[PDB]
Design a protein around this ligand. Structure first.
Ligand SMILES: CN1c2c(O)nc(N)nc2NC[C@@H]1CNc1ccc(C(=O)N[C@@H](CCC(=O)O)C(=O)O)cc1
Ligand SMILES: CN1c2c(O)nc(N)nc2NC[C@@H]1CNc1ccc(C(=O)N[C@@H](CCC(=O)O)C(=O)O)cc1
Lengths: 296, 299
């Protein structure tokens, strides 16, 4: 149980945040990532629409099974590609999504192209407000009327240098008109997932913002474990992805959506055990759509 | 160094168990000759496929060498004859310490008599377990054999809540000490998959207050979880990995992971959790007690 009153956000019906055991973990799957084989052209955003739709439908089916809500991590390396990717996601799921590029120019460029349909405001989450945020990003976010952003509380390493960042990143996000802050302290490698999780606990303990991370960042490149094949890679992946949840995290970017079938079953199990602690902490489940009431 | 109490680290025939989080790798305890282990043709006389049994022990040694997770064998028996034969086989076919494991105190004492005095028994045999309703005969049998390590099942129908379970110790530790036990592996018990969170909280209380190595059998309900197991591979294994790694994330020292056939996936999951926990040591100042650790092996 965290000292700070925990912020629970409703993003187009997706609840995220609260005391551990209050709400299920929100699972965030990546689509059109670098080397996503359904993409034939990452510059023009040419991709297999049948394959993309099949991933979105699988996500909805797994979400319905476990009670873990989903937000799509929509990656793009160009304004043209990310715009087409988001247009596809808008039409083919109801889920909220991350507008995700490592380039702030791609993110702002895509935002301008996507326009001012109120569906953008309701579903689009800015990924992310980072250490080197620009006044232009803040102004573009405000002009778009976005209310949720990922805050990437990461620099160049200890949890303390990550909190130092929160003018802070929260103050900057507030200037952009952001009211809902999804705090991501960043993940540098597999081993230091423990450092990230430490930063997550400070965020929830001190501020009560939802806290999460991308434990996916180095796991898929861990060839020594991945080369062992199934189910050895998947249980190692499960250990890494569930670790932040055991330390009270609210959301996980689990990497490529093709991994959803094993990720959801692992994360749902951790959620169920943590919610059983509610009986000792006095925490009330915020929803009956929870792994504890679904997976047994 | 999250626990207040100085943590006991035990050396059981070279297997280190205990410490502060990230100091030592998780000790993994696989079950052999469990009820409906299909390598047993006769559970009453203890007739088993010795080649299949040796293959499991050899696989355990290989996985242990790969990750650095040490191993103790959970030797289950339903009769004095069977458990005697199982322990005689384990003694000759591995160096690993082992749990003398029956739910019947009469079977545990019976097997102890059959095995009798042997410096190997005093070195490697761990009594599984000293329980709420222990008998004076058990304590006298344990002292006669000269055992120095026992599992303490800190569980009662009357003590479901974490604080209540550990209240049994002081008590169960006194009973063990009367039997000449010097090393206590505290197991608060696992009733179901969901209440592993309760078991893990009980492990935290033991380590916080007493500093005894704390562990459990998250295996107890996992293999009977039909809804998840019916999904098959790798869905059952990642769900089982979530259950088995959970106590370790909260500072537990050893896991009874169930049937040894599961060791290939269990070792890879637990080694990963151990590696991440040990990387925290750069911030707490805990010194890894050994270089034979997942953090230095799995990457
Ligand atoms: C960088 N990381 C991240 C983060 O840490 N925080 C936020 N908010 N957003 C993001 N977005 C992107 C990323 C999370 N998503 C990921 C992370 C990693 C991969 C990945 O490893 N892909 C593989 C190829 C796919 C594969 O091997 O299966 C690669 O080698 O690049 C794919 C997607
Ligand atoms: C009860 N539990 C336990 C415990 O909680 N604490 C201690 N110290 N020792 C023990 N020893 C026995 C047990 C831990 N080991 C286990 C737990 C469960 C199983 C198990 O579910 N076996 C089943 C399923 C076999 C299978 O489906 O693979 C069987 O039919 O035998 C097999 C072994």
């Amino acid at each position: 149980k965290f000292t700070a009153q925990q912020h629970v956000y409703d993003i187009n019906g997706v609840k995220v945040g609260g005391q551990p055991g209050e709400y299920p973990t929100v699972l965030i799957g990546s689509i059109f990532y670098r080397g996503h084989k359904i993409v034939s052209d990452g510059q023009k955003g040419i991709f297999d629409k049948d394959a993309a739709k099949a991933l979105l439908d699988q996500e909805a089916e797994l979400s319905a099974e476990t009670g873990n809500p989903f937000i799509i991590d929509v990656l793009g390396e160009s304004v043209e590609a990310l715009t087409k990717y988001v247009e596809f996601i808008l039409e083919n799921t109801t889920a909220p999504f991350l507008l995700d590029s490592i380039s702030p120019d791609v993110r702002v460029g895509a935002l301008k192209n996507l326009g001012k349909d109120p569906e953008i405001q309701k579903r689009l989450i800015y990924n992310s407000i980072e250490e080197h945020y620009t006044e232009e990003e803040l102004a573009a976010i405000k002009e778009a009327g976005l209310k949720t952003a990922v805050i990437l509380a990461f620099s160049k390493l200890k949890p303390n240098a990550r909190i130092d960042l929160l003018e802070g990143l929260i103050a900057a996000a507030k200037r952009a008109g952001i009211e809902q802050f999804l705090v991501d302290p960043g993940v540098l490698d597999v081993a230091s997932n423990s450092w990230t999780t430490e930063a997550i606990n400070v965020v929830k303990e001190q501020f009560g913002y939802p806290g999460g991370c991308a434990p996916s960042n180095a796991v898929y490149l861990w060839k020594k474990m991945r080369s062992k094949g199934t189910p050895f890679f998947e249980v190692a992946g499960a250990a890494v992805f569930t670790y932040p949840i055991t330390q009270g995290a609210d959301f996980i970017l689990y990497g490529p959506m093709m991994n959803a079938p094993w990720v959801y079953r692992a994360i749902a199990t951790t959620d169920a055990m943590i919610a059983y602690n509610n009986k000792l902490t006095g925490v009330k489940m915020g929803t009956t759509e929870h792994p504890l009431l679904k997976i047994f």
